[PDB]
Design a binder for this molecule. Structure first.
Ligand SMILES: *[C@@H]1O[C@H](CO)[C@@H](O)[C@H](O)[C@H]1NC(C)=O
Ligand SMILES: *[C@@H]1O[C@H](CO)[C@@H](O)[C@H](O)[C@H]1NC(C)=O
Ligand SMILES: *[C@H]1O[C@H](CO)[C@@H](O)[C@H](O)[C@@H]1O
Ligand SMILES: *[C@H]1O[C@H](CO)[C@@H](O)[C@H](O)[C@@H]1O
Ligand SMILES: [Ca+2]
Ligand SMILES: [Ca+2]
Ligand SMILES: [Ca+2]
Ligand SMILES: [Ca+2]
Ligand SMILES: [Ca+2]
Ligand SMILES: [Ca+2]
Ligand SMILES: [Ca+2]
Ligand SMILES: [Ca+2]
Ligand SMILES: [Ca+2]
Ligand SMILES: [Ca+2]
Ligand SMILES: [Ca+2]
Ligand SMILES: [Ca+2]
Ligand SMILES: [Ca+2]
Ligand SMILES: [Ca+2]
Ligand SMILES: [Ca+2]
Ligand SMILES: [Ca+2]
Ligand SMILES: [Ca+2]
Ligand SMILES: [Ca+2]
Lengths: 429, 429
């Protein structure tokens, strides 16, 4: 015979009697009591916990929880041998357990710019109770800002409710990177029972941002013949992402070889320095681009024009080019004349040249000996390096005191320290 | 005095004469010739290359390229000393050089799902010529499919044309991962000159795809008490991305500790195996989820329900519970009766139980001795393990041949190999 008893009733609640017919309890011992000569059976000071009983442990949904008990009728006119009877009390569930999350703080990581509608699962609540007394609903309590951004959805697919976050609008990590929601679970008892957990959405970073240089363009003066390791310039860029999506590498972009030889760009600090012989007379400007690149898996990159102006040093000593004109013409640094046609006639054309810049290539230019020849402007302009002078005569002269004219010229630039050159010519006669 | 001469003319082209006034060439030597008594000056079998001349090398845009030359008038009624004159021939540019890319194949990497409008720079073409004879336009020749996807844009920002790819629609790597375009550069000469390069767009992979399991759900039978390392089941998932965006890791998701003890999930292969004592009498089903996760920087993940049915083994030997009923009641495995009231009266209630399943818990149940007691059904149902029998009398008996009743019961299950138990009772008298 069967019986329906609510679980966890108070001691000595009567569960019933003889819809059949001394009575003894043979089995059911801790949880029940019977009375002699009545066969009315009541609960004990050990309450029946539907959730406690080994008898009811792994039972599948809606498989009824039955406690076995046996009682003996051992009187039939004190002649019969006793009659036991199989009993079954079906313990009925009450909402005496609260729905729960495994941890009271729950922590989702959602990437930046997840498309609208994207779903993410929330951990399930559980409830040791059965049927409508177990998990019933989920509710998403949220700050205003956050409410426009996040929704809740529940699936009846898996015959057990999987609650899910819907992303309702765009997330940007850079804008804001941490939200706070509470997820309320509730059961379907009366009264119901509920529980909460803090659901923290963490916005994860994507490499959605490129490097930018402090300045679009870069300029720097650099002194010619500087030593190996002299700081030319530091370029630096900026990335609004996080970690390696924002770590930066610097490398030459549109840089011809010459420059590559002379400069060293350091990838971490972005400090260009000298690594080679720098000569303004070779290359007066250094023009190149520089490439800033993040360490994202798909690297984003920027570039900046750099132009280095090479500053002059007086490292070039002037140059006295002596040469012929018209019919007069030199040979291994000496020429011919005799019984000169006139004074103020020209023996040589003389060009003085300096390869540096401004002052350091401004040339003064002087005839050494005691001879009868001067330099006279031939040019009709004032080009400060490119002097063209005639080497012309001062006094007439005859074949008797001649063939002994070593005219030597000297030149100095207005540099500091100054540099000088000397160059000569013999006139035979 | 000045002069305009086109570069790379044929030998002995006349560049002009005396808009002034023997004539000698003093400077300009390799590239020019003058004629005596005329002062008309013409080109040589060394052509003037505007692009060749050291004199014109690093010249900034539109800085004119001038070749210096000096000539001497050394006749003024054969009385004057000679007059030289500064010359300047301004060499004029002709479109004798073709616009070029550094490499003839160019190779851009664009990420999946780059937003429409996103720009990417193409390497610049160069042109050793000057002014309108240098780079003029860029043109993007393209296959139909590819044309809907990619545009060209040129910037006049940097005073030098930076050509750029515009992305015109969505790229999906999984769909198609390599395009072919040609980029045509052309100059602004007449006729113009042009050049091409193969521009290959490579679509780079983003982790835009989650794992999926072969099957939504997984089932497996597993024999109780199997050995450590026995293959239970292999779960496997699938990711349509590339590299580590598609490499997969398997780990238990909603798995209570018990299960964690008994099973070992291997992260690479996704093969669950035995790692602990499995007892159907402890846990008949193993229910858990499994988590597949890619090795993307922001891992995407799937999960699958797994349910393992534990199959029974005859590892439990039956259980003979002897106990009292009504007034008759046992004590350290023996009880009292004397001058029995009748035969077919019951001394004990006897329950035989096996903890296994089906056959291996089907019990036959037999009284050993030569005694006057049998087992008789007390229950009113056929529960195949839970037998309830009376141990009742066969023959009457008196106090003179008694107090020597060791009734022993034996039980065996229908398992293979079968298991047996024996249990006894003394009746004093
Ligand atoms: C570099 O980046 C910051 C943002 O991190 C920006 O506000 C700043 O103006 C940039 N440059 C300097 C000189 O701080
Ligand atoms: C796993 O992935 C492939 C695509 O790579 C899919 O077409 C296939 O059907 C999946 N499963 C099996 C059993 O091949
Ligand atoms: C070049 O030579 C002159 C002497 O002729 C010096 O004055 C000058 O400093 C340098 O030695
Ligand atoms: C239990 O004991 C019995 C003998 O009483 C055997 O038949 C059985 O196989 C097991 O040993
Ligand atoms: Ca309870
Ligand atoms: Ca309950
Ligand atoms: Ca509940
Ligand atoms: Ca962002
Ligand atoms: Ca970045
Ligand atoms: Ca970011
Ligand atoms: Ca130098
Ligand atoms: Ca210098
Ligand atoms: Ca100098
Ligand atoms: Ca040329
Ligand atoms: Ca040209
Ligand atoms: Ca050209
Ligand atoms: Ca894709
Ligand atoms: Ca993936
Ligand atoms: Ca992909
Ligand atoms: Ca077992
Ligand atoms: Ca078993
Ligand atoms: Ca058994």
């Amino acid at each position: 015979v069967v019986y329906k008893v609510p679980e966890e009733q108070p001691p000595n609640t009567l569960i019933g009697s003889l819809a059949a017919d001394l009575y003894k309890l043979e089995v059911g011992a801790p949880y029940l009591r019977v009375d002699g000569k009545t066969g009315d059976i009541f609960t004990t000071e050990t309450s029946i916990d539907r959730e406690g009983l080994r008898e009811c442990q792994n039972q599948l949904p809606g498989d009824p929880c039955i406690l076995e008990f046996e009682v003996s009728i051992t009187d039939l006119v004190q002649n019969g041998s006793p009659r036991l009877l199989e009993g079954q009390i079906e313990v009925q569930d009450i909402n005496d357990n609260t729905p729960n999350f495994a941890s009271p703080v729950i922590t989702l990581a959602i990437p930046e710019n997840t498309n609208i509608g994207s779903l993410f699962p929330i951990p399930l609540a559980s409830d040791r109770d059965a049927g409508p007394n177990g998990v019933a609903s989920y509710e998403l309590q949220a700050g205003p800002e956050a409410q426009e951004l996040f929704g809740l959805q529940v699936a009846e697919d898996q015959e057990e409710k999987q609650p899910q976050l819907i992303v309702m609008g765009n997330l940007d990590r850079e804008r804001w990177d941490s939200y706070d929601l509470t997820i309320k679970v509730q059961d379907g008892g009366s009264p119901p029972r509920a529980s909460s957990a803090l659901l923290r959405v963490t916005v994860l970073d994507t490499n959605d941002n490129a490097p930018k240089f402090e300045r679009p363009s870069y300029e720097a003066e650099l002194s010619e013949n500087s030593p190996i390791g002299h700081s030319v310039i530091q370029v630096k860029a900026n990335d609004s992402d996080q970690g390696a999506n924002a770590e930066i590498e610097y490398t030459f972009h549109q840089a011809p070889e010459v420059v590559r030889r002379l400069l060293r760009l350091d990838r971490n600090t972005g400090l260009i320095t000298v690594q080679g012989p720098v000569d303004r007379e070779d290359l007066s400007t250094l023009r190149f681009s520089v490439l800033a690149k993040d360490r994202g898996t798909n690297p984003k990159s920027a570039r900046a024009q750099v132009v280095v102006t090479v500053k002059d040093m007086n490292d070039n000593a002037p140059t006295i080019e002596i040469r012929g004109i018209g019919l007069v013409t030199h040979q291994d640094g000496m020429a011919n004349i005799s019984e000169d046609v006139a004074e103020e006639t020209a023996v040589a054309l003389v060009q003085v040249s300096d390869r540096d810049e401004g002052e350091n290539a401004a040339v003064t230019c002087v005839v050494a000996g005691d001879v009868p020849f001067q330099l006279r402007q031939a040019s009709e302009t004032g080009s400060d390096s490119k002097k063209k002078y005639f080497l012309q005569t001062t006094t007439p002269l005859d074949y008797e005191k001649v063939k002994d004219y070593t005219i030597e010229i000297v030149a100095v630039d207005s540099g500091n320290p100054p540099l000088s050159s000397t160059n000569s010519l013999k006139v035979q006669v």
